[PDB]
């Protein structure tokens, strides 16, 4: 049965552009701290660069008719169109709106569209439309239909501008088709059980040490490097990672045994991977590749693969769990296994290895959402500081 | 009285074209303080 | 049916002509420049291969703009509704806002017209009205300016009395000779004075209070406006506009600002004409709003006192006005408004005023001229 879009689900907008010839594909992405503004993410050539949907998702909270908001404003709903929806930021906490005021991308008309902290006023709430003749005002909303988005104070919609050299996203009198992608469900979540885009822990088999880089010596080059520590470096912030699946929608659905997915760590914003000298090494988003990226957790050591496997589109089945599931890490391409290499805080290097080791499992801690929001405000902090450092120094 | 000598020789070569009218030949009075900005200042300074 | 045709042309705003679809769009004053460029142009003007053959096309762009730009003020809404706070209303004006920026309307109206010139010969060169920038264009700016973005702030109003409205004053009392004033360019301004422009500035009357600063424009503003009420095309409903604006400005006015306004006020009124009742009336609530300022010593503290020129000047108005008005035939309602005048004047002037002992010699030689005062 067809999919509708309800209330507290978390998805992603996205629209398409015709740049050189080529259908490109583009989420609308909005980074909390910093600029207030919302940005283009592509999501295309995810085989090449790896997306990040972690500040694509916007997670509808309110679904209200034209008259009840306007009362509201005066003093699990499924979505129809027609009704004004309350997009919520999931990174941020914050709403999409529009900021009143306008960069000048060559539109006077236009009006720039960022994030509002207050759900008061009419900047924040936004009204679906019908893409085509073949939906109807008060019709459900389903998954794979295509949205035309209204701002309520402006009355301007969603647009798209391709004339502006670098393509940007704002409120304009043009239309453009939004398509919403479902990236999971809140309700339908197992709690206790891992889900995609998770930031977590890998402990080790002793379930005392974990995944960790090199402590802040200063280069970036010696924090590209991964081994394994115990200690506090478990409830510091170098020691956090984040699941991303190699599907844009159903995203956060649950992570099955075999599943390929990409590992990041959130405080330098660089991919695990496995070099050709059968050594891991953090490498840049701009060249993390699926060949070298993908990674999977399995439930035995045992060599039958699982081969191929259905995509379902949906929440699917809990399988593995937070702290009580044993998980190894295996290359989807190479088949090697993740294992310490051994030699003698305890700072033991990580390898990847044919056969491994007998305790190689490896245990799994879901970080609070607080833990990861600070460490992905430390990676944007030291990104825009250094910047400034680097322009001073110049 | 500077207004005046200059708006006396003014008129009296729009006549002497025979046809034609200035903005700034109103009066003093009607006159701005951006048009009264040269003969305030040139006042001022003799004065000084 | 406001709110639907807003809607309409912001869905399609190719409806607003390229200087205002949004994309590399020039602006309403970049247009309008644009426009009396291509109109002075002959080639872009006109077909060039009598008028309904040869479409201005410069007056045709114009007049496309302004038509736009009335339909919008109209389209704005209310100041009531405003008041009550219509959150629809509210966001309708935003859009308007947001459509035309303000800075673009002051330029329009900063604009300048051609006045007609008397030629060698003598007889009117008359600029065809067809082919130029007419005032009407002017006359929906100030719709859409008072109707949208509203005048409301003192700094805003001066600034656009000095940049915009007072050269047109200027223009239309400078047209006011015997040849210039029958000139269809000379009513075509009038009117749009009389029906834009001053009723505006009697609505926002009470903002001129504070106005120390702009001595020099507030009476240069004055002037204009008696030079233009002493016209003959005027016609009733205009004279009487014009009326209504000078006596509303006055009574908010400052009573040292208008002193100068009063030294041709006194070389006018003793004639007793019938383009004096209008200054009748302008004297007499002058006179009975500021009677303390001149019969105390001290007055008001923040206005102060008398300059005893402004006293010297009072008396002979009174005397003038008294003497006149005794040796001319009985009207009945001349000498109905003007037994007002004169008593609120005796009234004013205190009773123990000592005349001047250091009478002025050599005044203005402009103030002893009558033959157009300039």
């Known amino acids: 049965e067809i999919q509708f879009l309800r209330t507290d689900d978390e998805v992603v907008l996205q629209c398409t552009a015709t740049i050189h010839k080529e259908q490109q594909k583009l989420c609308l992405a909005a980074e909390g701290f910093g600029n ?154 197992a709690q206790g059980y891992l889900i995609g885009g998770d930031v977590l822990r890998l402990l080790h088999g002793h379930m005392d040490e974990c995944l960790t880089v090199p402590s802040g010596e200063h280069g970036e080059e010696q924090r590209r490097t991964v081994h394994y520590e115990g200690g506090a470096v478990s409830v510091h912030a170098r020691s956090l990672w984040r699941l991303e699946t190699l599907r844009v929608a159903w995203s956060g659905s649950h992570i099955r045994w075999g599943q390929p997915f990409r590992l990041r760590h959130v405080t330098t914003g660089k991919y695990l991977s496995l070099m050709e000298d059968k050594n891991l090494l953090l490498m840049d988003k701009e060249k993390a590749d699926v060949k070298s990226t993908a990674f999977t957790f399995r439930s035995s050591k045992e060599k039958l693969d699982v081969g191929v496997r259905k995509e379902v589109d949906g929440m699917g089945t809990s399988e593995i769990k937070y702290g009580d599931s044993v998980c190894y890490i295996q290359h989807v391409d190479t088949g090697l296994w993740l294992t310490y290499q051994s030699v003698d805080s305890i700072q033991r290097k990580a390898i990847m290895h044919h056969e491994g080791h007998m305790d190689d499992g490896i245990s799994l801690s879901r970080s609070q959402h607080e833990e990861s929001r600070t460490a992905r405000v430390i990676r944007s902090t030291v990104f825009l500081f250094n910047r400034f450092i680097r322009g001073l120094d110049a | 009285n500077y207004h005046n000598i200059w708006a006396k020789k003014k008129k009296m070569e729009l006549e002497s074209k025979g046809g034609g009218n200035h903005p700034l030949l109103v009066p003093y009075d009607t006159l701005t303080a951006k048009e009264k900005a040269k003969d305030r200042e040139k006042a001022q300074d003799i004065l000084k | ?33 644009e426009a009396i460029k291509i109109a002075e142009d002959p080639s872009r003007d006109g077909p060039s291969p009598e008028e309904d053959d040869t479409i201005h096309m410069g007056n045709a762009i114009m007049t496309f703009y302004s038509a736009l730009i009335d339909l919008l003020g109209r389209c704005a809404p209310e100041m009531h509704l405003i008041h009550a706070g219509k959150g629809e209303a509210i966001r309708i004006r935003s859009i308007l806002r947001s459509l035309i920026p303000l800075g673009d ?76 004033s029958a000139t269809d360019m000379a009513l075509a301004l009038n009117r749009y ?106 007055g ?47 009234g004013a002037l ?23 005062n300039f």
């Open chain 1, 36 to 189: 207030r503004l919302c940005f283009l993410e592509s999501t295309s050539n995810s085989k090449n660069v790896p997306p990040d949907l972690s500040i694509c998702t916007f997670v509808l909270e309110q679904s209200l008719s034209v008259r009840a908001l306007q009362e509201m404003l005066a003093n699990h709903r499924t979505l129809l169109y027609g009704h004004a929806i309350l997009l919520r930021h999931s990174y941020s906490g914050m709403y999409l709106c529009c900021l009143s005021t306008s960069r000048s991308s060559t539109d006077k008309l236009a009006f720039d569209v960022g994030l509002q902290e207050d759900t008061t006023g009419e900047a924040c709430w936004w009204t679906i439309h019908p893409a085509s003749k073949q939906r109807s005002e008060g019709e459900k909303v389903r998954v794979g239909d295509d949205l035309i988005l209204v701002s309520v104070s402006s009355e301007r919609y969603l647009h798209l501008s391709y004339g502006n050299g670098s393509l940007h996203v704002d409120a304009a009198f043009q239309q453009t088709l939004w398509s919403v992608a479902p990236i999971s469900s809140g309700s339908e979540a």
């Open chain 3, 300 to 346: 008001w503290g923040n206005f102060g006192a008398a300059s005893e020129e402004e006293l010297h000047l009072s008396r002979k108005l009174f005397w003038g006005i008294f003497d006149a008005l005794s040796q001319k035939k009985y009207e009945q309602e001349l000498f109905k408004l003007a037994l007002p005048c004169l008593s609120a004047v005796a």
């Open chain 3, 105 to 180: 309307l002051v330029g329009v109206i900063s604009i300048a017209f051609q006045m007609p010139t008397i030629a060698k010969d003598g007889n009117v060169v008359e600029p065809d009205m067809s082919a130029g920038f007419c005032p009407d264009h002017k006359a929906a700016m100030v719709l859409f300016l008072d109707r949208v973005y509203g005048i409301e702030v003192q700094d805003f109003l001066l600034h656009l009395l000095e940049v915009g409205f007072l050269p047109d004053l200027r223009a239309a009392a400078s047209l006011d000779t015997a040849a210039l």
């Open chain 3, 1 to 33: 049916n406001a709110n639907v045709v807003v809607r309409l042309l912001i869905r399609r705003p190719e409806c607003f002509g390229p200087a205002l679809r949004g994309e590399g769009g020039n602006g309403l004053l970049a247009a309008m420049e």
């Open chain 3, 350 to 372: 205190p009773p123990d005023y000592m005349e001047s002992n250091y009478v002025s010699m050599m005044e203005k030689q402009s103030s002893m001229d009558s033959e157009g």
């Open chain 3, 193 to 298: 004075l009389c029906t834009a422009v001053l009723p505006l500035l009697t609505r926002c009357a009470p903002l001129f209070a504070g106005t120390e600063h702009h001595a020099s424009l507030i009476d240069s503003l004055l002037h204009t406006v008696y030079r233009l009420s002493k016209g003959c095309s005027l016609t009733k409903a205009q004279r009487d506009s014009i009326e209504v604006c000078l006596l509303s400005i006055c009574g908010q006015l400052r009573p040292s600002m208008m002193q100068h306004l009063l030294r041709r006020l006194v070389f006018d009124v003793p004639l007793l004409n019938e383009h004096a009742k209008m200054p009748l009336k302008l004297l007499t609530n002058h006179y009975e709003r500021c009677w303390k300022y001149y019969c105390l010593p001290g």
